[PDB]
Design a protein around this ligand. Structure first.
Ligand SMILES: Nc1ncnc2c1ncn2[C@@H]1O[C@H](COP(=O)(O)OP(=O)(O)O)[C@@H](O)[C@H]1O
Ligand SMILES: Nc1ncnc2c1ncn2[C@@H]1O[C@H](COP(=O)(O)OP(=O)(O)O)[C@@H](O)[C@H]1O
Lengths: 157, 150, 150, 157
């Protein structure tokens, strides 16, 4: 405990499974995809701009999705609707697969989307943050915590 | 005086945090990733009297790999072998500690584990933007000792 | 456990002697004075993970100078520069401690002084011949610490 | 205190003055004589065999005397008589000069001769050893201590 690594993080819940990841370069692109295969991700959502070629990752058969939105903001309503619809279809395709989200800061807007998923799958807003922050300390800013509080399930997974 | 002062030292390990003991970034010997290992930089390494040297690109707060002394073993000065070649010969692990962390934990983990070196993060709340871990500098075993023996 | 175990450690510094804590000669990284500094021996130095390396001629118990890491600064591997040239570029002081000496004294002197390294002597009574100081090995600051933190 | 150097030692008493010294090589011969000039020695007594040339030392005007005797033995009676006669003449030549004795172990038979001098200048056998051992720990073996006890002043300095 109390010491850690520049390293992926996993959140599991029902048969949903999520990975939050570092940025690569092209320099360690081929190693990066091998991490992802190891967690059995079918799907990457880039929520922050990156410069690497995605097509090595896509060649090895992971669906890669470029959905960038503003630094430290809530996701716009399109992106949440997309993201929920994506999760339906991709856990329909394979139960107990993983969906990767990654940014260039692993705290912030990548875990927001995971917390959005967890809330519309069960657990309380209070509870949902706690599971995230246990795994990556200090996880959202106050605007995101606002949005995560003011958020309502349908409950559409 | 003395041993009595030291005993208070070990007693205050539970109080005191990494923040108190660290070497802040501006006083760290580190190299740019793009550095070449010519005669002079190799001299500068071997002058610095450090065995583990952090490697950054291209802002100093962005630590990327570690260079060990042992990594330098059969390098020829002006081969001019660049640094990131040698950092790419090895996985050396790089360990991160939180600035919160009490010294007695840190000491026990150093007693356990692989490297004598961690690098130091705090979370970062102010900012409009995303939260990020902010690099403060280095803490070693010898840092934690110096609390006791002074 | 723990900090309580450490406090006994500092309390036993007055009891325990250098004899108890030293690195004996057979486990010391040292070089012959006549050694040449080619690629391999330079590699062997930088592998050894030591910054101060004793220098002997020609029995190992006969320590003569110290080599520092900083001494190696602008040497070219296969110049083949011999060792005793580099040891002759510098007065580095070599310090000798008696095997009798209690740890709390040793720790305070290390707290004071120049090198983190002393080398260890006992007197020698048996023998027909002259009394001599007999070299046992090395003690460092990190040696004395390890008493406390274990 | 409690840490020390490969380094000369001085014993003073009345206007007698003595140096006990390490061996040099030729390699640091020229540095070695400069130590000796610094203590103002006129006289070196080699009591153990050494290989260096003495003539650099003798050129810089120090009387060098090769008086070897057996390892860990008392001095033979010639050597003591010589040594006492030398001390007379050389403190006659210059009061408050120093006489160097050196071996290849600075404990043993070099300090015996100094203790011989101190005994035939005053101080008690018990006292004389103590002044030596304070300066170089563990200084004589038992045969030498025997001889130093059984020794009688005339008192011929
Ligand atoms: N690469 C480095 N740059 C700057 N300071 C360092 C570095 N490595 C260690 N230190 C500092 O040196 C002190 C002692 O370090 P130590 O544990 O002896 O390792 P090293 O052998 O590298 O000096 C500590 O205060 C530590 O913060
Ligand atoms: N030249 C050497 N050869 C063998 N062991 C050494 C040497 N220098 C130090 N040590 C041993 O390594 C341990 C820690 O030494 P430390 O104080 O960290 O110095 P270094 O940076 O040279 O390792 C001690 O137990 C000490 O006896």
């Amino acid at each position: 405990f109390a010491m850690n690594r520049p390293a992926p993080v996993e959140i599991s819940y029902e048969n949903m499974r999520f990975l939050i990841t570092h940025n690569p370069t092209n320099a360690t692109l081929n190693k990066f995809t091998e991490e992802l295969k190891k967690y059995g991700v079918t799907t990457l959502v880039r929520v922050c701009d990156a410069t690497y070629d995605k097509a090595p990752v896509e060649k090895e058969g992971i669906h890669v999705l470029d959905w960038p939105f503003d630094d430290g903001a809530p996701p716009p309503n399109q992106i949440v609707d997309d993201w929920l619809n994506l999760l339906k279809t991709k856990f329909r395709e394979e139960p107990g697969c993983c969906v990767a989200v990654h940014c260039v800061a692993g705290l912030g807007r990548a875990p927001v989307l995971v917390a959005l998923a967890l809330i519309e799958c069960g657990m309380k807003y209070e509870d949902a943050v706690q599971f995230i922050r246990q795994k990556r300390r200090g996880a959202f800013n106050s605007k995101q915590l606002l949005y995560l509080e003011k958020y309502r399930p349908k409950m559409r997974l | 005086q003395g041993p009595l002062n030291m005993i208070q030292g070990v007693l205050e390990l539970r109080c005191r945090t990494v923040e108190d003991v660290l070497t802040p970034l501006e006083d760290c010997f580190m190299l740019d990733a793009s550095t070449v290992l010519d005669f002079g930089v190799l001299a500068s390494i071997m002058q610095s009297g450090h065995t583990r040297i952090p490697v950054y690109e291209e802002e100093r707060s962005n630590i990327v790999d570690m260079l060990y002394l042992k990594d330098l073993a059969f390098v020829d000065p002006e081969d001019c072998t660049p640094l990131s070649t040698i950092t790419r010969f090895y996985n050396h692990p790089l360990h991160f500690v939180f600035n919160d962390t009490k010294l007695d934990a840190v000491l026990e983990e150093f007693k356990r584990g692989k490297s004598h070196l961690a690098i130091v993060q705090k979370v970062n709340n102010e900012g409009e933007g995303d939260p990020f871990y902010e690099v403060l500098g280095l803490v070693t075993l010898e840092d934690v000792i110096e609390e006791i023996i002074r």
